[PDB]
Amino acid sequence: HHWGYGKHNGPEHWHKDFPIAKGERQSPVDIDTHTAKYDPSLKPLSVSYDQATSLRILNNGHAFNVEFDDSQDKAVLKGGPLDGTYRLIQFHFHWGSLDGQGSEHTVDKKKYAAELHLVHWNTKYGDFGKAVQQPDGLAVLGIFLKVGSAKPGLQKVVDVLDSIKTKGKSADFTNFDPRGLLPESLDYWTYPGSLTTPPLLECVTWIVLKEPISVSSEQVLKFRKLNFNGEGEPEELMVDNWRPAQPLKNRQIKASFK
Amino acid sequence: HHWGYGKHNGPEHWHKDFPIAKGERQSPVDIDTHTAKYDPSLKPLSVSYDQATSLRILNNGHAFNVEFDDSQDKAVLKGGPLDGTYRLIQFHFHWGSLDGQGSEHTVDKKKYAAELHLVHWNTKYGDFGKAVQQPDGLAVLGIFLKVGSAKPGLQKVVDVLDSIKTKGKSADFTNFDPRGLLPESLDYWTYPGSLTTPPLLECVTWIVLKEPISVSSEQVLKFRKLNFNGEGEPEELMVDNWRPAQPLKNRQIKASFK
Ligand SMILES: [Zn+2]
Ligand SMILES: [Zn+2]
Ligand SMILES: [Zn+2]
Ligand SMILES: [Zn+2]
Ligand SMILES: [Zn+2]
Ligand SMILES: [Zn+2]
Ligand SMILES: [Zn+2]
Ligand SMILES: [Zn+2]
Ligand SMILES: [Zn+2]
Ligand SMILES: [Zn+2]
Ligand SMILES: [Zn+2]
Ligand SMILES: [Zn+2]
Ligand SMILES: [Zn+2]
């Protein structure tokens, strides 16, 4: 039908329908820790997710999204490299077919098993739709997932995945607390970039956490049981839904830490 | 935030974002039975729905759709005005807030309480996506609903509507037999037209059945309990989701019957 992560509609081909794919501020990128220099003027990141109001979970054929009530400053991101206030709208993941791949961003070319993206939009622009049209419209907080101990806070998400196996399925998903998806340290890298999926708009201040979270082999396995396809179409397992690293070009990646 | 059937985003305004709304082959139309002349060269309609494989039912914020497995020539429409073979992909309805309105097509200006649309695409083009780009890409079989005796075959659909009350909700809907939604006679009118919702593409051969089906006041009342809005958004009842009759212009409506 349209773009995806397969042999013929995958990242390598997105440029055909989405010429910005070859743009100047594309994401993700490889974070080289020898050239991503500590910038002492970067403020600490302020994550306020205590009052986060989750609404639903859905399979859109590309990943699964947990969506939030973003009608108010309830769950917000502030500080770090950000001017003003960015509201949490949704989170989702990218993951691999094998533990050795799955993340979008890489660190010294190292790939993680998965990457969590918490998507926020700039309240200066009134709504998400207007925010995405601006170079400072979104802030995506990127968090690496490594295989290890189970993430207690992830368990509620994993539990409900059998009810959204196929494209277009959704379920009610209230009283989820996204704080349980964070690591201890909020040390980060940051750079100006893009959405990692079509339409690939260059509207994102990327904030990628240094510290990965630990998830269990079982939690990630449940991700890999999702389907790219709709119910009744041929089975195509939702795996390897990551875009590889793109050229940094004339951009600097700044580190919050030494 | 986009097109709909309300005061400010309704059919009267669709021309703003969708200039084809004022095009030459727009649907629906009023079927004037004094000018819609019997054409003895029209073949009888062949409806083959015996092997129809229904998949799911969903609320897309505009109507509810029952979708079908269209990977094979299993549920097809042939003959009548059609060249070749058209596959059933989905059906849906348009209805009113009151019994005296709701249909898209009208017959001598008479409005029915609701209208059923069975949507088929031309197998010559390989898939629906390619078919909609062609003037002969789709065939929509239009069936009027009048208030009267309950339609036994409609009951299974009505039953499951409480589980898809709001926008974005879907449910599994297998082993539905669409033959139960047909009248006895397959006498029809036909004319070249368009989708009655945005993007309003001019790709439809319309086949509208003369004989309405009878549904109960209770069956239609269940339709009117649906919501245009998503779960938790302010309630806007899914009623009066019809486009009024558009100008016929330089088109002829042909009747299969005398
Ligand atoms: Zn190319
Ligand atoms: Zn290096
Ligand atoms: Zn070095
Ligand atoms: Zn180096
Ligand atoms: Zn898509
Ligand atoms: Zn919102
Ligand atoms: Zn992402
Ligand atoms: Zn609910
Ligand atoms: Zn495929
Ligand atoms: Zn106007
Ligand atoms: Zn819509
Ligand atoms: Zn299909
Ligand atoms: Zn319709």
From Swiss-Prot, chains A, B:
The keyword Lyase applies. Its EC number is 4.2.1.1, 4.2.1.69. It is an enzyme of class 4 (lyase). Signal peptide: none annotated. Changing N60D: Strongly reduced activity. GO terms for cellular component: apical part of cell; cytoplasm; cytosol; extracellular exosome; myelin sheath; plasma membrane. Changing V140 to F/Y: Strongly impaired activity. Changing G142R: In OPTB3; complete loss of activity. Changing T196 to S/V: Reduced activity. Activated by X-ray, histamine, L-adrenaline, L- and D-phenylalanine, L- and D-histidine, L-His-OMe and beta-Ala-His (carnosine). Zinc. Can also use cobalt(II) with lower efficiency, but not copper(II), nickel(II) and manganese(II). Changing E104 to A/Q: Strongly reduced CO(2) hydrase activity. PROSITE patterns: ALPHA_CA_1, ALPHA_CA_2. Changing V140H: Impaired activity. Its main location: cytoplasm. Changing T197S: Enhanced p-nitrophenyl acetate esterase activity, but normal CO(2) hydrase activity. Changing L195F: Normal activity. Keywords: Acetylation, Cell membrane, Cytoplasm, Disease variant, Lyase, Membrane, Metal-binding, Osteopetrosis, Phosphoprotein, Zinc. It is found in: Cytoplasm; Cell membrane. The active site is at H62. It is linked to Osteopetrosis, autosomal recessive 3: A rare genetic disease characterized by abnormally dense bone, due to defective resorption of immature bone. Osteopetrosis occurs in two forms: a severe autosomal recessive form occurring in utero, infancy, or childhood, and a benign autosomal dominant form occurring in adolescence or adulthood. Recessive osteopetrosis commonly manifests in early infancy with macrocephaly, feeding difficulties, evolving blindness and deafness, bone marrow failure, severe anemia, and hepatosplenomegaly. Belongs to the alpha-carbonic anhydrase family. Target of drugs used in treatments against glaucoma disorder and breast cancer. This is Carbonic anhydrase 2. The gene is CA2.
